[PDB]
Amino acid sequence: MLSQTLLEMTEQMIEVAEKGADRYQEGKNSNHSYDFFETIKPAVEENDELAARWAEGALELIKVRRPKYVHKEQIEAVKDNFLELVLQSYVHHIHKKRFKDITESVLYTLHAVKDEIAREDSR
């Protein structure tokens, strides 16, 4: 197992963010039928655990090294905002600009973390 765990976690979160953004982006053109219970019940748990675990690791990394490009508040914010991002993506409680703004802030932060993770380089 040669795995960059904390990096892969971040890469995964980047995909989920773009997936949620893409979901809302297209969601209007194609007939999109879904139910808020079956596939979304576990999906919440995954992201809930994911964000909690990621934050713990990221917070550790920036304590060992030092947040140069990433902002600590942003790490703490992305964790929480990401959960609401996934929520608003499917429930459509979001309007327009804030959805892409949060996604942009998440992508921004994740890109910064991704750099500093590889900037230390894992063994």
Euclidean distance between CA atoms 57 and 51, whole angstroms: 10
Is the CB of residue 47 less than 8 Å from the CB of residue 16? Answer: yes
The residue among 118, 122, 120, 114 whose CA lies nearest residue 14 is: 114
- Give CA–CA dist 25/96, Å, rounded: 10
Residue 73: name the closest of 64, 84, 81, 65 by CA.
Answer: 81
* Closest among 50, 27, 41 to 87, alpha carbons compared: 41
Q: What angle, rounded to 10 degrees, do the helices at 97-120 and 72-91 form?
A: 140
> How far, in Å, CA of 121 to CA of 73, rounded?
23
How far apart (Å, rounded) are the C-alpha atoms in residues 108 and 99? 14
Method by which the coordinates were obtained: NMR
The domains found in the chain, sorted by start residue, are 1-123 (1.20.120.440)
CA distance 53 to 6: 9
Query: What distances in angstroms separate CA 40 from CA 15, 29, 34, 76, 122, one per listed residue?
Result: 17, 22, 9, 24, 33
Closest CA to 53 of 104, 108, 5, 15: 5
Alpha-carbon distance of 33 to 65, in angstroms, equals 46
Tell me the one-letter amino acid at 32: H
Residue 55 CB neighbour total at 10 angstroms: 16
Radius of gyration in angstroms for the set of CA atoms belonging to the chain, rounded to a whole number:
15
